[PDB]
């Protein structure tokens, strides 16, 4: 089970870095990491996607550059990238 309470509680500490870049914070790392470990299913996943576009797409100084980099910024072994292109519908 995922709600997207959860997926606002992990991603919080990422808000000011996916609008203005520069030094990712340790805490943001912990809450991308965090998401991921409790994504495990097909529909909890596919839950988080649509989660994390609605987010992006509530304010205009979200960038797209700035979400796509912060899985491959914060470690070597997160499985998903979600961005403005992603179809949830598609995320396995």
């Given amino acids: 089970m995922i709600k997207c309470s959860d997926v606002s509680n992990k991603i919080s500490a990422c808000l000011s870095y ?5 030094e990712v914070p340790a805490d943001c790392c912990t ?10 299913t097909t529909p909890d996943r596919q839950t988080a996607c649509n989660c994390l576009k609605t987010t992006f797409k509530s304010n205009k100084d979200f960038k797209s550059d700035f979400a796509a980099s912060l899985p491959s910024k914060c470690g070597v072994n997160i499985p998903y990238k979600i961005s403005l292109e992603t179809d949830c519908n598609k995320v396995k």
């Fill in 18 to 22: 996916l609008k203005q870049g520069g």
């Fill in 31 to 40: 809450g991308v990491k965090g998401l991921n470990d409790a994504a495990k």
